[PDB]
Design a protein around this ligand. Structure first.
Ligand SMILES: [Zn+2]
Lengths: 154, 101, 215, 128, 84, 60
RNA sequence: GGUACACGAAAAACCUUACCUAGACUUGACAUCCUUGGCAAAGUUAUGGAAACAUAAUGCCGAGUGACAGGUGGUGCAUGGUUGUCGUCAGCUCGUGUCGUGAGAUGUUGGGUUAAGUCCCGCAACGAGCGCAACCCUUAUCGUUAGUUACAUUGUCUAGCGAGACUGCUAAUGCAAAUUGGAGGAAGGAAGGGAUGACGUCAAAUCAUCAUGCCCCUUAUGUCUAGGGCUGCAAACGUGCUACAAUGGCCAAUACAAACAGUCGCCAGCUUGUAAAAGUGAGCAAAUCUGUAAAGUUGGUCUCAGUUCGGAUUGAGGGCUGCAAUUCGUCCUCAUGAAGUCGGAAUCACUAGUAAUCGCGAAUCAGCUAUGUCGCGGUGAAUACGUUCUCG
């Protein structure tokens, strides 16, 4: 086992003034290169002003609010043919998983160029389509179906 | 004079011994000779050699030694030929190896 | 499997045994392979002198071999007949243009040096002396000299087969784990009639506090 | 009135000079602009976040010389030099600079490549 | 490729092949140097080149020019795999 | 066949590339250090003995 | 098996080399002792030879003599030494004493406290040893001695010394160790890391480093030499590399390290060369001179497909080392472009400057598809809710 693990701090970006944007730029990073992902995300921002003219922060928070999952799933088995257990997860991991879903689903689509695909991903997340809201809805629907296990668990 | 800029450079594989030698030279030169700027530290050329421990394969456990080589530098403004006469009797140890201008 | 206790403190608590330098890796190898021959000749050919160690000091075609032996006269010989002999083997193993100027000096309280005690253990064991009583006599005589704890262990054929019957002896404070310890270590190959006997001796020679660096 | 400092993040030194000047500060690093030297990212923004919690480039010139490391280490070194320079200019800044944990020399540096480990932490692989 | 007098021979095999070529051109002569390349003069003779066990004969022809002498002598056999 | 390798290594070679490096004390023709002419394990044993002028324990 | 599989071996065209074929040699290639002496020792050129070699000649060394020399021949189930794993895991024991007829137990147990048998309270136990701890090195801050070959819109910097951090102070709670909180402070409660690895286990590995008893060989299992083979080939596994593409392909401009190494070498600059390179020719025994960082930024083209991705395979022409590149080196240019659009059961690594990823240096070595290893710096993450399961 181990004890409780402290978390390293993440600094907000003082240009759009949101630390969730910093977690965006962190998760969408590959190879350990802030510059390339930074240009990608800022081009996506410029596209947000370009089509569907609206505050990028507003569509950002709307996408975060729609994609966030209400409940999580935890494995607690007894014997063969294991059974799941839905438990409660704090908001930090909830937004972390929402961002992870946005990142993974963005790089799974048509419109080959990253700029338009990630922009369409954030647009769909704001508008509640099957791109990512489908996954959250499914993971919610497996929850509260076997909630009898959730009530009596440990 | 007839021999300005005696640029003696001393190099050794030990530090405290070289420090003792340079202290002795700076104290002895502190007599007749003048205008001798202090000791000059140098980046201490360093290398590391790595050797496997076991006579047989055992590659995952190997150690490594290190042959340190410290380095200082002196410059003498002028010979003051009597000064080199006093210099003839320094008898520096073998560990410090000298190299003048 | 543990590290040699000599090497861990060597170079930071113990001065080197051969201080010299030459042209970069041109014949420094030659000088090392040569003076190790002198070292081996001292430790091998003359058992009766109990040479603790030898110091080799070369600088550009000069050599001075300081020696520390319990009994200097055997190296000296009678009316200096042996000193000239030993120095001429040293010459013929070093060349002819290099001055030699050897010196021999008795070592005060030699019995606190693990080298001579290990050599005595090798001599006793090779002579079919029962190992346990030889260990006890040597251990008592060493400890009585006013030193700290000792560690003597012996492997090999202890008068027969099934060598996994090895005896070890530990008699007080001898802290390997302490770097500032002033510990001594040696090793000899007691070539018994049944094979090879390796004797190892650890000597604790007091605290070495405030040393700063090597002596 | 020159104000001094020093920063040493990730094998990168940084000597700074600050003077209260007429303009907002006229950022000049290595006699050239930061915009073309450092790519326009949060890295160029990081140096004035010490200033944000203070008089934000009211009148404080920037005269910095930089050596060593890459550019992020350069940015950390110059940031620490700046915070030291403000501390030298005014002691009253300890309570607000240290609270945000801007000083104190983060000292996160590439470790030594330990043998048996590919990048000082990675084992080759496991096989039974 | 040698790039300077590229056609290379051990320089000892020249004398006997030149002699024989001007001495009624005897076919069987024992050679071991797989090191050599062939000059244009080489065409005409046979040689008992050594692979590592014994001598195998090779007849040189003008059809090829420039290829190594020893390449005509295979040294390693084929698979000959058993069933299991 | 080891001692004959010792004597062959010493003899002047017919070709510049004929000769190779080898420890003087023993004939291990592998891992020999040109900077010391001494085998890696030989180097280790002599360094624990301390014949080499400069040897430490690596902390670097 | 973990603890073997980019291992011995930090470099096999010849040697290496221990194997095979063939050529030759025999107190022998090499060593001592016995007897006898004092001038050749090597290397060089014809000569037959592929070459050991027989020649003929130039310029410490010899001649007869047995113990024998020699063995990479065997026995790690005789071994010394060395090393791996449990494992940097917290464990292993001893002296006196007591209990028990006895093996044995009591210390080492009980409570809190930690990474720890770390400490302290209780205790028929009192103490002690190995280990752990701290003493070492190294990075993180400041002060000083020093100033070049650094630096010099200058005190950076390097390397020596010293200070600093010692639960130091405060709050709580505890008997006390100690725990947590706060202030100061660069760092606060083993600061990051290295070096250091107990008794022993696995008859663990190594007789092929070395030494090594015993056995075996000796005009041969020893010696030298030329060629080959250690690089094969129906197949399978292991560790790596390139990828399978637009986070990208290509083109032009473009700046940013650190460490290490180098006078038979690094190679500046220049010329020729589509290029491998070739030539000229400084400086550099070196903080001087040299060994152009790549990622990154800007601009442009490419527009999603076995492709302007991908590079094997194959053919040719050049280059370099080396006497020499067919087994059996490598680089450059031209020519074609396999297969692969993310991969089955299953698995591995990692808690930060780490992973990933970008390059740079060194070693053995003249040459090395080392993509290996050993090191240096650039950019630069997520999460640890928690121990129910799983591994030990
Ligand atoms: Zn050796």
């Amino acid at each position: 086992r181990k004890n409780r693990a402290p978390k390293r701090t993440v600094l907000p970006d003082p240009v759009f003034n949101n630390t969730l944007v910093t977690r965006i730029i962190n998760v969408i990073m590959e190879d350990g290169k802030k510059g390339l992902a930074q240009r990608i995300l800022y081009g996506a921002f410029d596209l947000i002003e370009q089509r569907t003219k609206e505050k990028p922060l507003t569509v950002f928070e709307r996408a975060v609010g729609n994609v966030m999952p209400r409940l999580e799933l935890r494995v607690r088995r007894i014997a063969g043919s294991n059974y799941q257990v839905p438990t409660e997860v704090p908001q930090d991991r909830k937004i972390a998983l929402a961002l992870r879903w946005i990142a993974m689903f963005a790089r799974k689509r048509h419109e080959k160029t990253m700029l338009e695909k990630i922009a369409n991903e954030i647009i769909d997340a704001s508008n509640n389509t099957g791109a990512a809201i489908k996954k959250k809805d499914d993971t919610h629907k497996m929850a509260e179906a076997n909630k009898a296990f959730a009530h009596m668990r440990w | 004079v007839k021999y300005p800029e005696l640029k003696i450079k001393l190099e050794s594989y030990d530090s405290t011994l070289l420090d003792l030698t340079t202290k002795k030279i700076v104290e002895v030169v502190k007599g007749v000779d003048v205008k001798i700027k202090g000791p000059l530290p140098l980046p201490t050329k360093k290398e590391v050699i790595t050797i496997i421990r076991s006579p047989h394969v055992d590659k995952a456990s190997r150690e490594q030694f290190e042959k340190n080589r410290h380095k200082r530098l002196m410059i003498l403004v002028d010979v003051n030929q009597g000064a080199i006469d006093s210099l003839k009797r320094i008898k520096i140890p073998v560990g410090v190896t000298l190299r003048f201008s | 499997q543990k590290v040699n206790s000599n090497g861990l403190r060597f170079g930071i608590n113990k001065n080197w045994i051969s201080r010299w330098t030459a042209n970069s890796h041109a014949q420094t190898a030659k000088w090392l392979i040569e003076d190790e021959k002198i070292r081996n000749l001292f430790f091998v050919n003359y058992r009766n002198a109990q040479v603790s160690n030898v110091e080799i000091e070369r600088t550009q075609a000069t050599v001075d071999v300081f020696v520390y032996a319990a009994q200097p006269a055997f190296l000296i010989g009678s009316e200096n007949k042996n000193i000239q002999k030993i120095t001429k083997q040293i010459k013929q193993i070093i060349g002819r243009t290099t001055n030699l100027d050897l010196t021999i000096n008795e070592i005060g309280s030699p019995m606190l040096s693990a080298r001579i005690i290990a050599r005595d253990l090798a001599n006793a064991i090779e002579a079919r002396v029962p190992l346990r009583t030889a260990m006890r006599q040597s251990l008592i005589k060493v400890l009585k000299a006013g030193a700290n704890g000792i560690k003597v262990l012996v492997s090999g054929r202890l008068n027969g087969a099934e060598i996994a019957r090895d005896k070890m002896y530990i008699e007080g404070n001898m802290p390997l784990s302490t770097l500032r310890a002033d510990i001594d270590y040696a090793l000899e190959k007691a070539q018994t009639t049944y094979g090879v006997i390796g004797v190892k001796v650890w000597i604790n020679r007091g605290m070495i506090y405030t040393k700063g660096l090597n002596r | 009135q020159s104000y001094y400092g020093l920063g040493r993040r990730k094998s990168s030194s940084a000597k700074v000079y600050l003077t209260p000047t007429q303009d907002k500060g006229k950022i000049t690093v290595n006699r050239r602009d930061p915009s073309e030297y450092f790519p326009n990212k949060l890295v160029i923004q990081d140096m004035e976040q010490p200033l944000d919690l203070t008089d934000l480039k009211k009148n404080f010139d920037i005269n910095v010389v930089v050596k060593g490391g890459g550019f992020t280490g350069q940015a950390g070194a110059i940031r620490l030099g700046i915070v030291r320079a403000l501390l030298q200019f005014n002691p009253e800044l300890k309570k607000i600079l240290k609270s945000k944990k801007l000083t104190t020399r983060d000292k996160r540096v590439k470790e030594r490549k330990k043998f048996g480990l590919y990048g000082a932490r990675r084992a080759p692989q496991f096989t039974k | 490729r040698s790039a300077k007098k590229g056609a290379f021979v051990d320089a000892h095999l020249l004398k006997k092949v030149i002699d024989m070529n001007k001495q009624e051109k005897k076919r069987p002569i024992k050679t071991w140097s797989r090191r050599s390349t062939i000059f244009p003069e080489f065409v005409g003779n046979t040689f008992a080149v050594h692979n590592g066990k014994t001598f195998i004969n090779v007849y040189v022809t003008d059809d090829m020019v420039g290829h190594k002498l020893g390449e005509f002598s295979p040294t390693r056999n084929f698979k000959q795999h058993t069933a299991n | 066949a080891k001692k004959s390798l010792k004597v062959k290594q010493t003899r002047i070679p017919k070709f510049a590339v004929r000769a190779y490096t080898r420890c003087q004390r023993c004939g291990r023709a592998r891992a020999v250090l040109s900077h010391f002419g001494v085998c890696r394990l030989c180097f280790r044993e002599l360094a624990y003995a301390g014949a080499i002028p400069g040897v430490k324990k690596a902390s670097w």
